Amino acid sequence: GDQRFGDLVFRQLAPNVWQHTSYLDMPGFGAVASNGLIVRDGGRVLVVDTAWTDDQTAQILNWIKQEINLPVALAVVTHAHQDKMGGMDALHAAGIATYANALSNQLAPQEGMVAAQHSLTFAANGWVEPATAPNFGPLKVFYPGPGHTSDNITVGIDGTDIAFGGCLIKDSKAKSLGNLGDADTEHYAASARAFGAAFPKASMIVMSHSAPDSRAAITHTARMADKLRLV
Ligand SMILES: C[C@H](CS)C(=O)N1CCC[C@H]1C(=O)O
Ligand SMILES: [Zn+2]
Ligand SMILES: [Zn+2]
Incomplete structure (x- = not known):
């Protein structure tokens, strides 16, 4: 169910939701996949x-221009690492309104990122x-507490089964x-739980570095965060 477009991969998750996946191309490490979302909210994206x-991010815009062909109203980026915010200059050059957690x-600047x-x-x-x-629109934005980072935020998509944990x-x-x-190794477990509680009906859990999964990803993450806290 994946479709290669350039160095990018796109996977439809619902009628109006697609996963985009890009891969880090640095001479020192393997092809590390990052997942984000594209949501068609009626007459905008x-x-x-x-x-x-x-460049990867402009490549995303091009796929949207081609396969959907509606203007991109805004982007929300979910924490200040490169896999989430590495492409801000591209979104700005394209006239797209950008959002991030204030903390993000x-x-x-310290992280090497352009701010939203x-x-x-x-x-x-x-x-x-x-x-x-x-x-x-349908984007429901929830800050679950410090976990993978201090700033990590999460997004539920109204009208679908999907919640995005980043x-x-x-x-x-x-x-x-x-x-x-x-x-934050102390709050991680509770923060994962807070995510699952914030979107209690979501049955498809989308994340940055694994294929979509069921709710068991939430509990599994929480347990691993608890094991680490106890050492
Ligand atoms: C640079 C990215 C930002 S989340 C990262 O830390 N990753 C990407 C995949 C997992 C983890 C790692 O490198 O160990
Ligand atoms: Zn990160
Ligand atoms: Zn990441």
């Missing part, structure tokens, strides 16, 4: 996360303050939590 690079925008144009803020219960996320969640068969250099 919404993007969750860039690709690794500007604050960390951007607009900053999301969040209630104590983790739900986005609606005024900071205007006209987000790099916070790994699939049910993953061996480890991956690079934990930026990780």
Whole structure:
């Protein structure tokens, strides 16, 4: 069910949702896949996360221009690493309004990232303050607590079965939590649980570095976060 387009891969998840996948091409490591989302909200398109690079991200825009051919209203990027924010310059050159967690925008420079144009803020219960996320359509944005990073945010897609965990969640068969250099190892477990609780009906869990999975990815991630906390 995948379709290669250039160095990119696209996979339809529902009538109006597609997974985009890009691969890091650096002379020192293997072809590391990153997943993001494309959502057709009626007469416009919404993007969750860039690709690794500007060119890869423009390649995303081209696939959208070709296969959907509606204007891209906005993008939301889900934390200040390269696999999520590596392509901001491309989104800006294309006139696309960009959003990130305020904390993500604050960390951007230290991380080598260009900041998003607009900053999301969040209630104590983790739900986005609606005024900071205007006209987000079916995108339901939830900050689950520090985990994979301090800033990681998550997105549910109204009207579908899908919730996007970003790099916070790994699939049910993953061996480890991956690079934990930026990780809050104390809150990770609770933050994964908070994600699953925020989207309790979502049956397809989409993540950054595994194929879509069921809810078992959430509990599996939480357990692995608990095992690590206990050492
Ligand atoms: C550079 C990316 C940002 S999330 C990363 O840390 N990754 C990509 C896949 C897993 C993990 C790793 O390198 O160990
Ligand atoms: Zn990351
Ligand atoms: Zn990642």
